[model samples]
Structures are given as structure tokens and as C-alpha cells.
Target: KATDIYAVNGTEILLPCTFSSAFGFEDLHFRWTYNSSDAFKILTEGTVKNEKSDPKVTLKDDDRITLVGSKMNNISIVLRDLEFSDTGKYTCHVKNPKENNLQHHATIFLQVVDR
Candidate 1:
């Protein structure tokens, strides 16, 4: 289960979502999205662009937002340069189609404050 996470503005934080099964980054479909009153928007989906795009939210190249671990290991994401406007609910959705299309997800509420 996931809960609220607090961080300081202009800092870095990790939004956790780990899996215990034997699956690598290529074996699972990962989707990161932001939830707010404006509307839910996908930040990235399986290494591809989704609903929207922002330099602050990176799925590749950028070390600021990299995924940790390999198959069946930790699947958390690193978010850097936190901003006041970044405060909201973020969902880490993972799916393994090979395993009966199994899916698991966790939501983290991020609260950012001035440093």
C-alpha cells in the first residue's frame, strides 16, 4: 500500500512501487500519471509519451527521473527538482500481460513545500 509523501521544493524524491515477481522493465507496462481536479494525465507509458509531456517528467535519458532495479525487483521512480505545482496524487501502474495479464498499482500523494 502507498501513502502520502512530503518533499521540499527544488529537491528530489522517490515514488515507490515495487514488484516481487520475475519481470523486467521490458516485461511490464509501466504508467505514471498525475491526478488532480484539472484531470488525470499520463506522464509516461512504457517508455513512451502518453497524455502529456513535460521536461520535469522524464521517462528516458534524464537521470532525474530514472527507474531503479531490474526484473522482479524494485520499480520505483525518482522525481527531481520538485516544484510547488507538482503537488498532487501520482499513480504507478504496472501490468504484466504474460502473467494472466496481472496488474498492480499504487498511488502516492505528493506534498511539496518551500525549502
Candidate 2:
């Protein structure tokens, strides 16, 4: 988990969760969830990219959080503006609902520091 080790508050954080697949997947749905002290909150769902799901969670208009390269194989998540609360396990769930389902998990520690 390269993305899980470290993060600083107010900075941009990128979580690279890639899959090594021989073939392609259809109807690719990307979902991200953050583990909090109380409960797990859905950060992004489907591939639409919605930041309103959580007030504290903010996405860049162009590149806040993005899926780089092709969607078939190179599936990854890029998160920006790291906060103290953003520290935790962020899970990336990819599924076709018809073909197969895959889960990629990463732990991130957001360190909040004084300016």
C-alpha cells in the first residue's frame, strides 16, 4: 500500500490502485469509501465523481480525483486536498455487475499540522 503510508493536511494526495488484468472489463464502476472513527463514508460512487457526498471531502474540478489512463486495465484514484480526517483506509471497489468484481484497498494517514 504505497498510498496508505503518508499524507499531509491541505496537500494533494494521490492513491494509485492499479489492477493487473489479462483481459478487459465492461461496465466498469469505480467506488471509493473512507473509514472514519465512527463509520465508513462513500467518497465517490460509480464513475460520475461527486464531491458533495461529504462536506469535508472536496474534489478538484479538473483533477482533484481522477482515473488515469484507460479504464479497462489502468484503474487508479487520485485524491487532492488531504485533511486530518482523510486519514484512514480508502477502499476502491471495481465491478461490472455482470462479469466480475474486484476490491482494492489502501490505507492513508493524513497528518494535520499547524501553519
Candidate 3:
């Protein structure tokens, strides 16, 4: 499944991958990756950095990303200072190892534009 989002270029936006599972969220594994690469691979532990040259890396540390409370039935991230370069597909993946490693994913096409 996929969705499209249009937001101001310099504003913060909340991207959600909210869902509930029979296995509950505590044991479920979820990830957020940009496009198809690990542009901004968000994991449960923390952030990940891959050696590559990309326009979004202009922010140096990518400190604009923040995680929201997704304890029960929601998984979302608040991206501050959205950039034009940030306009692209953001995919959220969930892996439920309990269900024989069943994996489900979805994408959101983020379009950052000037207000």
C-alpha cells in the first residue's frame, strides 16, 4: 500500500505507520527506510549511518528526526525542517518473528514544497 503527502518545505511533519498486531508491538520489529536505500534507516535501538553520498546528508547528522510514542497502536516520526531534498518515498516495514517472520510494509511518498 502507498500514500502521498504534501507539506511545506521548512515545516515539521508527522509520518505515521500506525498499526496493531495480534503479537503486540513490544515484540514486533519495525523499520523506516527512505526510498529503497538506507538513506535514513530508523531502528528501535537508534539511528544508523551508512557510508554514501546523498543530498540529504547536507544536514550532517540528520538531527531533525524524532520518534513519537508508538507503544500500543501507533508508530510515527516527526521530521523537523522538512527539505525539498527530503521529497521521496518513505517506507515502513514490520517484521513479526513470532508469526514465522511475517513481514509487512507500506510507503508514503513525501512531497516537500514551498508554502
Candidate 4:
């Protein structure tokens, strides 16, 4: 499946990911990353947002980057202050200890431009 997102530079964009399982969501661990070659975590299972993931990302004080999805099943995160460097494939990974090696991932490409 192909999912594409476009946002003007300096604007905000939401990358979406949702899932469900028999075991439930509490034990499930999920994360967002970019570029397999220089892969880095954009979000993670703990508190959710991680600032060290990317320098261009904002997560301090006001938390310009945040996971706004409700805990029920949604796991989307909103990234603000988009830049040309943000134009790349973002992948989301979800894992549940209740399942063995059963993996799930969704990849989407974002394009940041002037107009």
C-alpha cells in the first residue's frame, strides 16, 4: 500500500497509524522511524515522544511534535515545522508480546515544499 503526505514548509503534518489485537493495546509497543539507512526513532513506547530522535524535530517545552491519537487504537503523531529534510519515508512499527514474531508496519512518504 502507498500513502503519501504533503505539507508546506514550516507547517504541521500528521502521520497516521492504527491497529488492534486480541490481547489489547496496553502491552503493545510501537515506534516511528525514518530512513532505513540512517534510521532513527521519531516516537517510541515509553512516554511516546523523544526529542533526541531528530534534531530538526521539536518536542521540548510546548512539544511541537506530539502523539495526539487516543489510546484506544489510534497511534498517529503530529510533526510541526516541516522542512525539506522532512521529506522522506516514515515507518511505524507495532509489536505485542502476546504474539510471537507477528510484526506490523506502515510506511508513508511526506513531501515538504514551498507551495
lDDT of each: 0.66, 0.55, 0.60, 0.63
TM-score of each: 0.70, 0.62, 0.70, 0.72
Error of 3 at 42 (Å): 5.4
Tens-place lDDT digits, model 1, residues 3-104: 888999999998876554543333456677788988777766553222122112235434456665444345577889988988999887766665555555
Candidate 1 yields a Cα-based lDDT of 0.66
Task: State each candidate's clash count.
Answer: 1, 2, 0, 0
Tell me the spans in candidate 2 whose CA falls farther than 4 Å from its real position: 1-3, 47-64, 69-72, 106-115
Q: What is the alpha-carbon lDDT for the whole of candidate 3?
A: 0.60
Q: Write the per-residue lDDT of candidate 3 for residues 18-83, one digit (tens) a residue.
A: 655553433555566676344665422222121121112112235787667524445577788988
State in Å the error of residue 6, model 3.
0.3
Q: Which candidate number has the best TM-score?
A: 4
lDDT of 2 by residue, 76-105 (tens): 566777666666776766555555665655
The residue-level lDDT of candidate 3 at 52 comes to 24
Local distance difference test, candidate 4: 0.63
Candidate 2 has its poorest 10 consecutive residues by lDDT at 48-57
lDDT top scorer: 1
Which regions of candidate 3 fall more than 4 Å away from where they truly are? 23-26, 36-61
